[PDB]
Amino acid sequence: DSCMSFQCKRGHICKADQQGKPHCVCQDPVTCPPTKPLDQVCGTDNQTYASSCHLFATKCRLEGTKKGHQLQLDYFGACKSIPTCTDFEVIQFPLRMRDWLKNILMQLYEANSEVKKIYLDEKRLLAGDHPIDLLLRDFKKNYHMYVYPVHWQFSELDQHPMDRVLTHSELAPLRASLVPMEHCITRFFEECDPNKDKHITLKEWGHCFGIKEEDIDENLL
Amino acid sequence: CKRGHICVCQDPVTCPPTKPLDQVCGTDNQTYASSCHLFATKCRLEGTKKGHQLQLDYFGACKSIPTCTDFEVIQFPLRMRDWLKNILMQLYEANGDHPIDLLLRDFKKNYHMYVYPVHWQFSELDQHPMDRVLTHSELAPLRASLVPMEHCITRFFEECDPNKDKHITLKEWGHCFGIKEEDIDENLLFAS
Numbered sequence A: 001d002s003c004m005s006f007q008c009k010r011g012h013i014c015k016a017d018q019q020g021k022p023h024c025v026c027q028d029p030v031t032c033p034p035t036k037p038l039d040q041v042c043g044t045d046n047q048t049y050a051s052s053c054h055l056f057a058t059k060c061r062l063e064g065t066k067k068g069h070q071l072q073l074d075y076f077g078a079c080k081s082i083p084t085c086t087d088f089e090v091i092q093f094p095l096r097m098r099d100w101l102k103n104i105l106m107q108l109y110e111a112n113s114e115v116k117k118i119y120l121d122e123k124r125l126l127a128g129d130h131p132i133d134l135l136l137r138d139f140k141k142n143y144h145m146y147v148y149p150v151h152w153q154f155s156e157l158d159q160h161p162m163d164r165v166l167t168h169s170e171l172a173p174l175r176a177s178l179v180p181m182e183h184c185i186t187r188f189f190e191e192c193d194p195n196k197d198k199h200i201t202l203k204e205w206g207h208c209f210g211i212k213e214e215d216i217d218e219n220l221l
Numbered sequence B: 001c002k003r004g005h006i007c008v009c010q011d012p013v014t015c016p017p018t019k020p021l022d023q024v025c026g027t028d029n030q031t032y033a034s035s036c037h038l039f040a041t042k043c044r045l046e047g048t049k050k051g052h053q054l055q056l057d058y059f060g061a062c063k064s065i066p067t068c069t070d071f072e073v074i075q076f077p078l079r080m081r082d083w084l085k086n087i088l089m090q091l092y093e094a095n096g097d098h099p100i101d102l103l104l105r106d107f108k109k110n111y112h113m114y115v116y117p118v119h120w121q122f123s124e125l126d127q128h129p130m131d132r133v134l135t136h137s138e139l140a141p142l143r144a145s146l147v148p149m150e151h152c153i154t155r156f157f158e159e160c161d162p163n164k165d166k167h168i169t170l171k172e173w174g175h176c177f178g179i180k181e182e183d184i185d186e187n188l189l190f191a192s
């Protein structure tokens, strides 16, 4: 068997020729391992695939075409309609701060349901478009607790290739992982690429996490 | 007199003046000018279905948001959520036999990372009164805090109260967070 150790790209498998010569052919989706519900994945076509094996077998069958070239794994789970991740869903605050925020919101609710002056201005941020960002603005100025984590996330992603900008393919693992963790879809190129050139610089990334320009420093990468 | 009462109904006119940012969302998915106006409205409607149901839901105007998931409600420490994120990103970059199924099944069986926090959250909420069950008034502040913090709406009494008695026991709570019965333990709750 010449197919032993003959490597093939994902969605392809090695099959011997009528002459015994090994060839990479598309994988038949029927041969994909049986699937459990949580194996499901959502493709960039907003189609749900039973598993990653099924998606790449489909992509292979579609090699050479627009839909084939476009199809990628988008995130884990079935395709869903979900809101855009916020910055703090991407890069979280310490648990102590999340308990504090939860407690003032709960306390603010109990005072208003079936104190009010204390947290009045706080109440009116929630009717705003970015309540948590504004309430946590002072925290975001701390280097060890916020600024450095924001830089470290950029440099962790800027690897394919490392060039001080992030592209779609570099952000795709982060997008895929936040759906199960946070039930939100990142939209970095709708929100953090204001010149629409499809490359996110450190300045664009920092601004999108609300870090002042004076605190953005390429030496931390 | 109760909120919205002053016992006659409160005149909406005497409600403090309202700014746009005073708006609130009622459980009817209606936007009210402020919390005062919502309960004044509730009073004018006392005695009816629409009247009895109406409660404060969350601050701000009503919006479209999905139902909260288990991992949105349970707040993890940074170190553990960072570990979980890096594992998931590694599973993506690669693309067990069913990695995501196995990862989440094992995670939800882990006591220090998940089972105990699910029990702690029940017990933090079970205070009015402390009686080993959760009612609407105990879960309503958690719901309102999760809208701004997680952009999701909890639906505890539609999904975690299968006998429809308006009380959520520890057993119902655990099952609704995907905890096996063998791992539900009243000894993990704050002492009596």
Ligand SMILES: *[C@@H]1O[C@H](CO)[C@@H](O[C@@H]2O[C@H](CO)[C@@H](O)[C@H](O)[C@H]2NC(C)=O)[C@H](O)[C@H]1NC(C)=O
Pocket (backbone or CB within 6 Å): A046, A079, A080, A081, A082
């Ligand atoms: C991608 O697919 C998901 C799943 O079918 C869509 O979410 C559905 O959207 C419809 C509205 O057209 C709603 O009635 C359903 O409740 C949604 N289902 C879920 C599970 O969220 C989503 O809208 C699709 N997005 C696009 C752009 O096609």
Ligand SMILES: *[C@@H]1O[C@H](CO)[C@@H](O[C@@H]2O[C@H](CO)[C@@H](O)[C@H](O)[C@H]2NC(C)=O)[C@H](O)[C@H]1NC(C)=O
Pocket (backbone or CB within 6 Å): B029, B062, B063, B064
């Ligand atoms: C609760 O009310 C809000 C506000 O009217 C609804 O949100 C809107 O939904 C419509 C159509 O579904 C959209 O055109 C609007 O853009 C939405 N507004 C916002 C602010 O998101 C929401 O759908 C209602 N909730 C339910 C469950 O019906």
Ligand SMILES: [Ca+2]
Pocket (backbone or CB within 6 Å): A157, A158, A159, A160, A161, A162, A163, A164, A165, A166, A167, A170
């Ligand atoms: Ca790069």
Ligand SMILES: [Ca+2]
Pocket (backbone or CB within 6 Å): A193, A194, A195, A196, A197, A198, A199, A200, A201, A204
């Ligand atoms: Ca750009």
Ligand SMILES: [Ca+2]
Pocket (backbone or CB within 6 Å): B125, B126, B127, B128, B129, B130, B131, B132, B133, B134, B135, B138
């Ligand atoms: Ca109780």
Ligand SMILES: [Ca+2]
Pocket (backbone or CB within 6 Å): A089, A182, A183, A184, B072, B150, B151, B152
């Ligand atoms: Ca969320």
Ligand SMILES: [Ca+2]
Pocket (backbone or CB within 6 Å): B160, B161, B162, B163, B164, B165, B166, B167, B168, B169, B172
């Ligand atoms: Ca019950």
Ligand SMILES: [Ca+2]
Pocket (backbone or CB within 6 Å): B069, B070, B176, B177, B178
């Ligand atoms: Ca649940």
Ligand SMILES: [Cl-]
Pocket (backbone or CB within 6 Å): A007, A008, A009, A012, A024
């Ligand atoms: Cl190949």
Ligand SMILES: [Cl-]
Pocket (backbone or CB within 6 Å): A090, A091, A092, A093, B078, B081, B082
């Ligand atoms: Cl984080």
Ligand SMILES: [Cl-]
Pocket (backbone or CB within 6 Å): A093, A094, A095, A096, B076, B077, B078, B079
């Ligand atoms: Cl923490």
Ligand SMILES: [Cl-]
Pocket (backbone or CB within 6 Å): A086, A129, A130, A131, A132, A133, A134
């Ligand atoms: Cl916010």
Ligand code: NA
Pocket (backbone or CB within 6 Å): A181, B071, B072, B073, B074, B075, B076
């Ligand atoms: Na969480």
